[PDB]
Each structure stands twice: as C-alpha cells, then as structure tokens.
Amino acid sequence: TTLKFAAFEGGYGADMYKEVVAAYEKLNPDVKIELTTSKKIEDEITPGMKAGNYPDIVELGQGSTSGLTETLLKDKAIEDVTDVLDMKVPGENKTVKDKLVDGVIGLYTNPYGGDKTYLMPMYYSPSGLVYNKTLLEQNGWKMPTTWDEMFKLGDEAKAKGISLFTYPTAGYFDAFFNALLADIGGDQFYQDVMTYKKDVWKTDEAKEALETTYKLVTEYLNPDTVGYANAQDFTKNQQSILDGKSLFMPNGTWIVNEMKDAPRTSGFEWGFAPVPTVKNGGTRYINTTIEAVWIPAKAKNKEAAKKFMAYLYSDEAASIFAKTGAIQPIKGNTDDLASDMKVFYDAYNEDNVKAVAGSFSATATVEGKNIKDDLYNAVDSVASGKTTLQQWQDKLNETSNALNAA
Ligand SMILES: CC(=O)N[C@@H]1[C@@H](O[C@@H]2O[C@H](CO)[C@H](O)[C@H](O)[C@H]2O[C@@H]2O[C@@H](C)[C@@H](O)[C@@H](O)[C@@H]2O)[C@H](O)[C@@H](CO)O[C@@H]1O
C-alpha cells in the first residue's frame, strides 16, 4: 500500500514529518508513504485535486491564507474520521481517544458541530503574547493582566522608542480573538460568536473586543507591521521582538524553533503570557492552538491513511515531533518538558488562567462572504486606516447574520 501524505511546513519544521514517516515505515513494512511537505501545500495539492489525484491524508489546519481546509469542509469533501478515535494506535494497544488530552475534541475538530469528527487534532501549543522577558524586567515593567495596564505600558514604552505591539500575520488573531472574546463575554458568548448567533456582533461584549483591538492596532502598533504581515515577511515582525523594537506579539510555541537561527538582544529570554482581559479579577484564557490532520473524501486509501493517522498519537511519533517543540495532544506529553518550552506551558499554572479553543462553525457558507476575512484579515485594513471601527462591526454583523440565515 502506497499512501500520499501532504503536510504543511510551519515553524516546527518539516524534518519531523520525514522522521515520523520513516518511523512508521519501519514499524509497518507493508506501507510506503510519499511525503510532500511545503510552506505552500495548498498550491501543491490543489491542481492534483481538481485533476482527480487526491492525497490520502493531509496535515493542514484551519487558518491558512488559501483556506483550503475550510473550503473542502464547505464542499463536504473531508472524510468522517470519527472512527479514528476508536482505532488501535499502531505500535501500542491503546485507542486514540484513550490517549487524547481533555479539551481538544470540540468545534475545531467537529466543524459542523455534532458528534462527528472531521479534523483530528495536531500539536498542542499554547498561544497568547510572546515577548522578551529580560527587556520587560530591565525597564521595571510587569506583565499586564488588563488592557488598561497594557496601554499604560504602551505609553511608557512609547516614550522609550518601543512600539507596544506587532503581529506576524493578521491570521494570528484567531488565537488572540479566541482569548479576548472569551475574556470579555465568557464561554457561552464565545460559542455564540463561533456559531453566528444573530446580532452577536452588536452586543456590548463583541463591541468591546473590537474597540480594544482597534485601539491596539491603530495607536500602539509597530509601524512596519502591516507591510510585513504576509507569508513571506511575517518573521520580520517577529524579529522586532528579538530586537527590542516591539514588546508583544500574539504567537505560539513554534516561535522558538522558527527563530532558532536569529540574532537577538543580549540576555534575551523568551517570555509568554495570556492575552490581558478587560476587568480586574477576570479569567484570562490561553488558546490551545492545534492544527489538523484529515483525509479527503476522494482519497483512494482511506483505511491505510486512518491507520497511519492513528500512529501520529503514538509515543514514538510524539517523541519525534517534540524535538522542535511540537507537542502532540496526548496525555503526559507535557511531563518532562524541554526547558525552552517551560515558560510557555507554565502560564497554565497562573491563578485564574484557563484554556480556550475552537474555530468558526462550518455548518453554513455564503458566496462572496468570509467571516475569517472580516474578523482576522480586516485587522490589516483597520491598522492601515482603511476601515473604521463602525465599519468593522457592521461588516462582521452583516456576514455573521448572513451565515446565520443559511
Ligand atoms: C505565516 C505562517 O505560515 N505561519 C505558520 C503558522 O500559521 C499561522 O498560525 C497562526 C496561529 O495563530 C494563525 O492560524 C495564522 O493564521 C497562521 O498563518 C496562516 O498560515 C499559513 C498557511 C499562511 O498562509 C499564512 O499567510 C496564514 O496567515 C503555524 O501555526 C506555525 C506552526 O506550524 O508555523 C508557521 O509559523
């Protein structure tokens, strides 16, 4: 059996997929895997798909620029892999679900919101705000827990010639908004946004999420941010953190390996912290950032791909992924963490800090509309002065209500 496997090359690198594929072929001598890894995995497989040649299994989460996963989800072109949760992990005698940590099978994995899983969870990386711990301590600053403190810090930093905030690409606001929305309104309000409850963007809580972000990207943003907020130059904005020209950026644990070969200010130490909330004593949420592994409905070897998918939750697979910081969402995989990951996961141990996860529902779609463009990509426009706060809200409410109608 020959499996065609396409995987996204992100901050964790592609060598881990080469080694994992090699390790599966050593365990399972009857399976050969043709692995394709690429930073542009959409452009690789989409021509073959529209020509009839589909890969058997794809590693690509929600949130890409092309939105390939969401598109195939809209065309009902992604195989139901709920039975993968019950499969025996190759090399072991445990089921996939026996090994999964809590709070990783949800709206992201069940984009139609039922009991059917279509995107199996990949990785397990906390997202929040990444900064230089040493730079903050050198200036006598403490990590803000509220946005009032965050903007007062922005003023203090601005007086020293340091921008408060930057971001790699606008897409990185999926984790940011997941935290900020849940911080302000709570869990039910969060699910309501993700599932397009009518007029949810007209609520005071959704307006406050937009006002806070509007103030951030229009008054406390590194001036070079939007010009570099693309797939080719996103690391430039990330470098401004290592250079000390920007304090904070929304990011996840892949940043450590992704910026492994980069210069940085003397004494640089990674800092990690939840996005601040708006109210004293409010819960702060860290985003469980996962990507997805999935099988197209047109795949020709679904059964062999499912068995290989189960192997991605094995101890062997987890130890290979872990070398670059990619922590598979299996139990105990945060025990015995590498030192460079401790600052990130230790944020879960802070008082009144919990987890948030999920993405937008795929149960409805409207031609010409894209809620992820209206919420995430619209930051670039808002930061550029092309979109007012009222225009931002009106667009989100219109798109969300339209999606509600379907
Ligand atoms: C620029 C890039 O590819 N970065 C990836 C990173 O993808 C981003 O992950 C964050 C998580 O908050 C957001 O989902 C963001 O939208 C992602 O960026 C998109 O992904 C790719 C496909 C690209 O088209 C971008 O233009 C999009 O903005 C990965 O999470 C990370 C780990 O694999 O590696 C890279 O850094």
Numbering used by the authors: 37 to 442
Task: Provide text from the study.
BiGFL-BP adopts a canonical SBP fold (structural cluster B), comprising two domains joined by a tripartite hinge with the ligand binding site located at the domain interface.
The Lewis a (Lea) and blood group H type 1 antigen (H1) trisaccharides were both bound with about four-fold lower affinity than the preferred LNB ligand. To bring insight into the binding of fucosylated LNB forms, we attempted to co-crystallize BiGFL-BP with a commercial preparation of Leb, which resembles a superimposition of H1 and the Lea trisaccharides to assess whether the protein can accommodate both fucosylations simultaneously. Surprisingly, the structure of the co-crystallized BiGFL-BP, revealed electron density for the α-1,2-linked fucose (Fuc) to the Gal unit of LNB, that is, we got the structure of the protein in complex with the H1 trisaccharide. This indicates that binding to the Leb tetrasaccharide is too weak or unfeasible, relative to the H1 trisaccharide, which may have been a contaminant present in the commercial preparation. Potential hydrogen bonds from the side chain of T101 to the C3-OH and C4-OH of the fucosyl unit were observed, whereas the main chain amide of the same residue has a potential hydrogen bond to the C4-OH. Another hydrogen bond from T205 to the C2-OH of the fucosyl was observed. Notably, the methyl group of the fucosyl unit is accommodated by an apolar pocket formed mainly by the F44 and the Cα-Cβ bond of S100. The electron density of the fucosyl is less well-defined than that of the LNB backbone, indicating the potential flexibility of this sugar ring.
